[PDB]
Amino acid sequence: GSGNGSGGGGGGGSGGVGISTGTFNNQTEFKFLENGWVEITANSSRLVHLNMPESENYRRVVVNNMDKTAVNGNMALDDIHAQIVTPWSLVDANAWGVWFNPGDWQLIVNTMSELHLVSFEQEIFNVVLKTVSEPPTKVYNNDLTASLMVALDSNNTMPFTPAAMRSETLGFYPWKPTIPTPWRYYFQWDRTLIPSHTGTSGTPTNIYHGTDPDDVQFYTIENSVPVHLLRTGDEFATGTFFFDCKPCRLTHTWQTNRALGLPPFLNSLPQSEGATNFGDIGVQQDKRRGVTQMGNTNYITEATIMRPAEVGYSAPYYSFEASTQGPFKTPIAAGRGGAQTDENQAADGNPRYAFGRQHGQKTTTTGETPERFTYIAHQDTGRYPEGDWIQNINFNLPVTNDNVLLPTDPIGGKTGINYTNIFNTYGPLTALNNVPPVYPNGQIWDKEFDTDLKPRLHVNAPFVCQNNCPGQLFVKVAPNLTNEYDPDASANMSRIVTYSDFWWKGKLVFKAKLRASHTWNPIQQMSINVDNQFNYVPSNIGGMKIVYEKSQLAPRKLY
Amino acid sequence: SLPQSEGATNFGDIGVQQDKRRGVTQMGNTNYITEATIMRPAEVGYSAPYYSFEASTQGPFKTPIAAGRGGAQTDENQAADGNPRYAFGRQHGQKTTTTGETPERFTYIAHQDTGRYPEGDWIQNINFNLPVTNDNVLLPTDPIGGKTGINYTNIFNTYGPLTALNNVPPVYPNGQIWDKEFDTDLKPRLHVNAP
Amino acid sequence: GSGNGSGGGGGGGSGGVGISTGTFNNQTEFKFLENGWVEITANSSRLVHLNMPESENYRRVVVNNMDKTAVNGNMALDDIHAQIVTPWSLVDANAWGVWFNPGDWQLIVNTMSELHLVSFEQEIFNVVLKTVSEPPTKVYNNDLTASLMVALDSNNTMPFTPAAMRSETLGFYPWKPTIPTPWRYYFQWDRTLIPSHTGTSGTPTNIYHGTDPDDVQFYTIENSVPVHLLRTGDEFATGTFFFDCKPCRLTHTWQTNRALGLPPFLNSLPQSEGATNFGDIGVQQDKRRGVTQMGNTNYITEATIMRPAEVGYSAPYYSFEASTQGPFKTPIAAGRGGAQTDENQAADGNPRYAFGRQHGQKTTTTGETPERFTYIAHQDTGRYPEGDWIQNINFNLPVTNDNVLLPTDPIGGKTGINYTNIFNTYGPLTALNNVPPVYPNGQIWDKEFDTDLKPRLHVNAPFVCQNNCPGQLFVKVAPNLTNEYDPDASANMSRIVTYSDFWWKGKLVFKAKLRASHTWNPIQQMSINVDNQFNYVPSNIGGMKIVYEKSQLAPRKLY
Amino acid sequence: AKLRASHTWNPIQQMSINVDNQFNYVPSNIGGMKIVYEKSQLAPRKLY
DNA sequence: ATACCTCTTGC
DNA sequence: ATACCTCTTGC
DNA sequence: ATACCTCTTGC
DNA sequence: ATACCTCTTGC
DNA sequence: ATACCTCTTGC
Ligand SMILES: [Mg+2]
Ligand SMILES: [Mg+2]
Ligand SMILES: [Mg+2]
Ligand SMILES: [Mg+2]
Ligand SMILES: [Mg+2]
Ligand SMILES: [Mg+2]
Ligand SMILES: [Mg+2]
Numbered sequence A, C: 001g002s003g004n005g006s007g008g009g010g011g012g013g014s015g016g017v018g019i020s021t022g023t024f025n026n027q028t029e030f031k032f033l034e035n036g037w038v039e040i041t042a043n044s045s046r047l048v049h050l051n052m053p054e055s056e057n058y059r060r061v062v063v064n065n066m067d068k069t070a071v072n073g074n075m076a077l078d079d080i081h082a083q084i085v086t087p088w089s090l091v092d093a094n095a096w097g098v099w100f101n102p103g104d105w106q107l108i109v110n111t112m113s114e115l116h117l118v119s120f121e122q123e124i125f126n127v128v129l130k131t132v133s134e135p136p137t138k139v140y141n142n143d144l145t146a147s148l149m150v151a152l153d154s155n156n157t158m159p160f161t162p163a164a165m166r167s168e169t170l171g172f173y174p175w176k177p178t179i180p181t182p183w184r185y186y187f188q189w190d191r192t193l194i195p196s197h198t199g200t201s202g203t204p205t206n207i208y209h210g211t212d213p214d215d216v217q218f219y220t221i222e223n224s225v226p227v228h229l230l231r232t233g234d235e236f237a238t239g240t241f242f243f244d245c246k247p248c249r250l251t252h253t254w255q256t257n258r259a260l261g262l263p264p265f266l267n268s269l270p271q272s273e274g275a276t277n278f279g280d281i282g283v284q285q286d287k288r289r290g291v292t293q294m295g296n297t298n299y300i301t302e303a304t305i306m307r308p309a310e311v312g313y314s315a316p317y318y319s320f321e322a323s324t325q326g327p328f329k330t331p332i333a334a335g336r337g338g339a340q341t342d343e344n345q346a347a348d349g350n351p352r353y354a355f356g357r358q359h360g361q362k363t364t365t366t367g368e369t370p371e372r373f374t375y376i377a378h379q380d381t382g383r384y385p386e387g388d389w390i391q392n393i394n395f396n397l398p399v400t401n402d403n404v405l406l407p408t409d410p411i412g413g414k415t416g417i418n419y420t421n422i423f424n425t426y427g428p429l430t431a432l433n434n435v436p437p438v439y440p441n442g443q444i445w446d447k448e449f450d451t452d453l454k455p456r457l458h459v460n461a462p463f464v465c466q467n468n469c470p471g472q473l474f475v476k477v478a479p480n481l482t483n484e485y486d487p488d489a490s491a492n493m494s495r496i497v498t499y500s501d502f503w504w505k506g507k508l509v510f511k512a513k514l515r516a517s518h519t520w521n522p523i524q525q526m527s528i529n530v531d532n533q534f535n536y537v538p539s540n541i542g543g544m545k546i547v548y549e550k551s552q553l554a555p556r557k558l559y
Numbered sequence B: 001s002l003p004q005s006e007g008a009t010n011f012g013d014i015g016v017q018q019d020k021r022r023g024v025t026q027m028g029n030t031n032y033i034t035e036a037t038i039m040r041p042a043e044v045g046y047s048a049p050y051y052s053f054e055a056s057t058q059g060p061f062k063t064p065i066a067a068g069r070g071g072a073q074t075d076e077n078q079a080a081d082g083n084p085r086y087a088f089g090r091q092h093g094q095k096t097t098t099t100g101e102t103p104e105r106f107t108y109i110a111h112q113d114t115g116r117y118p119e120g121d122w123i124q125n126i127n128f129n130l131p132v133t134n135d136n137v138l139l140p141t142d143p144i145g146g147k148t149g150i151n152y153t154n155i156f157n158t159y160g161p162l163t164a165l166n167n168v169p170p171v172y173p174n175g176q177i178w179d180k181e182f183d184t185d186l187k188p189r190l191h192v193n194a195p
Numbered sequence D: 001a002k003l004r005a006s007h008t009w010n011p012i013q014q015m016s017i018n019v020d021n022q023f024n025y026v027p028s029n030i031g032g033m034k035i036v037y038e039k040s041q042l043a044p045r046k047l048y
Numbered sequence E, F, G, H, I: 001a002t003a004c005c006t007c008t009t010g011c
């Protein structure tokens, strides 16, 4: 029935028991420079809460949903894999929402034309630790001398696990607390699994072989980073980090192979208004002057005519490939979009995000179903397979069935397939763009692969750091023991129930550039209205939510 | 959900409905999120036709690969496309005393797990309604062009802007060490004969 | 039902109540220098836990398992001895495992050729003390003003008790806490005990005489070291210590007397492959040219021929000798090894380690039986007695039974004995090596004897400090009293239940040298594989273990 | 070239001799010689 | 033109 | 802030 | 350590 | 006080 | 008197 004793505070220049060590700031600054450059500084802070780990051990676990895949035709459902599980927790902040609110986004997006990522740093403070002790009256006392541990993997020794890919970054609301996630990482494993269908006879091999001892790697924080111990008075801070990576644009393109170059001169123009009064080239398709890449005909049509190269490309879908560890969907860059979609035509390439209350779902809404959406980029660089086709070289037309392959004809005798599903047109002439950011649920920057050769882009984030990326930040509560402890014993050790709270504050800097009017007509711009109006404000209860928004609004020539 | 005792059957469990999990995919239609669905930043390795022979002005020739294969599902017998094979005489490794003019040989199987296991591949209809119907899926089993011993994986290709991979590794002692680059305007990102 | 009061923290430059005083680091550094020297720096930290002593007294206890020895034929089982028991606890860290993990070991061992011990220092911090107070609800409160005591025997006044000899050093896992052991030391005593056998009639004298007052020595910390008192804010640190001792090699030898020098020229060579096509010297054994140490014959054989000196030596076993205080096994240097062993032939010289979870045994395994092993060095410098023999000087052969003594003939009329059991061949020509390290359970360095003349080596560790060795570190909880205390009273004093936790961190430095290829064939190297693969990783539960590994892998000429 | 350094807790793969291959590295009683092939990228590295 | 199984008892 | 059982590997 | 809804009544 | 799996983007 | 959709490859 004691308060513990209240203990007394000694005082240095950067801290003590009853001395704050930090300052809260989650404010965003725009600073206009000469020539239309802007320096955007975004501050962000949060109160973070964290419990002691389940157990102070590292574990090696295997996951096995064999049963589900055992089904036949449920290949895609495979979740098998191995992983190391640590006692540490990770503080990840890589995600649009952590840093900006809508108002901000708006601005950026409407007035700028390109954006560069500059630097970033973070710090922790006002640390606090309390212990619970318990008729179920729970009491809480500060444990003045206990500690919080912190480690920053600046060397990037640990494997990299961006958490946004699972919606586990921090929260997006400055005024409400949040937490870090428990850290874990992939551990190697061999695995086989033969695809099958409903109609498939017997049991296609489906097994977990084990682990290529060659491929083994087991890391630990303890052995690789220096751990800091903070007490309340303590505080920690990373330096400032600078990024090396390309800029990101905020404009989208729209021309496709069809709109490149000099359109054909029309010998004949309409003479009155009306949406049926077309113009006419006025020349026999087989009599026109110009250039093609087709040696046989004399036809020259908007679809035949030569273009300098090729925007976009086509690839297989839905493709699953498989290697040593099981199958996985083959990614695309492009996505699709347009008039012939409307989220329902929604296909391959468009990404889809799913998430919780901490990241956008309405706070007050009950029921644990995740909120979702499919981002549909503005950039018209994807494909409409249905429109594709292939024909015989003789090119005698109108064309015969025997000389043409359609998205309609079935391949391999399977009805619901056609060449477009296994087609691929990437090649030296291909040209395209990087994905666009996705607010607020998009990852912001990402690490590059350590392969000898490399992707030309990643699909999860727009900024890929060329060199090293900022090291991960882990934390964890220091074990607080009871008076009984026998390491020699097999049992798990008992600890005092302990937990901690601390504030975290970060600063992320971008640099961008104002855009300027070039066309006569105005352009698209994000804006509020009666329809969405409520998405941007709390409910009479404090309901909040963050809807997704687009990024590359304005157009730009492609050529 | 974690296991509570040792034993190679005590798996852990995510503990969430596959169609209820949070996260990201590159698939606009479902709500499924599985280790195979989930989005990855890009793609290691690629898949290519085999055994492919192409032909130009001077005759046909095998189309080369970078990757090779390897792993648990091989053991030199599964040995396929990509793995290189060296053959040679006494001056270069074959036992000096051994008589008989048959060359000694081997197939180098790299350690780097960057190749493909075609059998495992598959393709399905966009509607992605599953478990899947035969009509909506193409397998390494179904025969293409009406030829039994063929399937899409033989003419498939997945190289693309997202692809990522490594250079071959050296091969002692029979590997070439360095090599000249082609005088074309555009160039290979690597050669397969030397590092 | 109070929290004690929580007390308030004052602040100096090196500490306070809510100020951390240390940094956790258990990381290992390799720093490559010019000429292939490396500086290996190994850091290591632990959370140490410690309870108040059973009693604040020094006691003088005698141990007596008379009964067991009383048996007859159970001489070896004698455990008698005297000892002082202190209230202090000892922090010992002298043991391979404290400092390196396997990964490390690997490296070292595969790429280096010799290793030197350089310096070492340690420190303690983030001290904490709590008190337990108690329906059995135990509550824990910090006692802000209580203290921890610490003493460092830099003068080496206390008798030296390396704890690894009993597996009581600290733990080997950075991520799990551990503890110090209770300190005690031998106290002199006189004792007699006549060996006997099963078949032995009556009661062989078997007694504890007492104590040669001459030989008496009783030390106390208090009277010999300065004790520091740390409070939470306090922290302590030893200087840095430098070792003076020989290097240790990481290569083993293999030639025996048989492989020294110029082999005999073969006048006749094989002409085809096959493991039966031997070569032939081609000269009558009694007609060859060369040198022996045998004046009588003319025989010259690989076993007769003279060698420059003698590798290895032979000694009695199993020998027990006895002096003033009872019997004890006579130690050997060599051990044995090879083809004719396989842990089952395992004899005299090979050492055997036994230990708990804190030191390698599987953490999850239940049941208090110790894990064990017998280290079998790679260096081929031991003997195979069975092979030995002795013969009459006349050397007329083939030899007669009357002229030869075998490992088979029984000595003293005892069946199960032969000369080799009491044999000894050490002598001026003998040559040999130091023991090799034993990871992870081996002691690392050891003190030298204060005798006028000295051992040429120790068997428990490879590094013996020539001068002084780093002083022992003791700690102990300061008595925390109740309000009642009467020193004048005979009863034991009552104390508040108190205990403490603190982190300890050390740094140990070696310096080594890279090795280089010299032979055509590759050599042995430690490596992982399917078979051992799991020894190096945690179980799905957090099971851990550390298997033993070898040290002198590569070979080296001996001559 | 550049020396490598330990980073994981577990040791890694390493080329080594043993009873099985032992003879590949030495001449026969006749002078038989041979050179077997060996691997090159033994150790692992994160890819990401 | 020999230095402790390389270069290198060099520099 | 460890030197050969003190102070004191100081001075 | 408050300046006209940011940074910034700074520089 | 984060740099490309150590020390060490140090010196 | 042409520089990457302005002024402005200026200053
Ligand atoms: Mg650093
Ligand atoms: Mg570094
Ligand atoms: Mg393997
Ligand atoms: Mg592998
Ligand atoms: Mg002193
Ligand atoms: Mg002294
Ligand atoms: Mg006497």
Ligand SMILES: [Mg+2]
Pocket (backbone or CB within 6 Å): C212, C214, C215
């Ligand atoms: Mg005496």
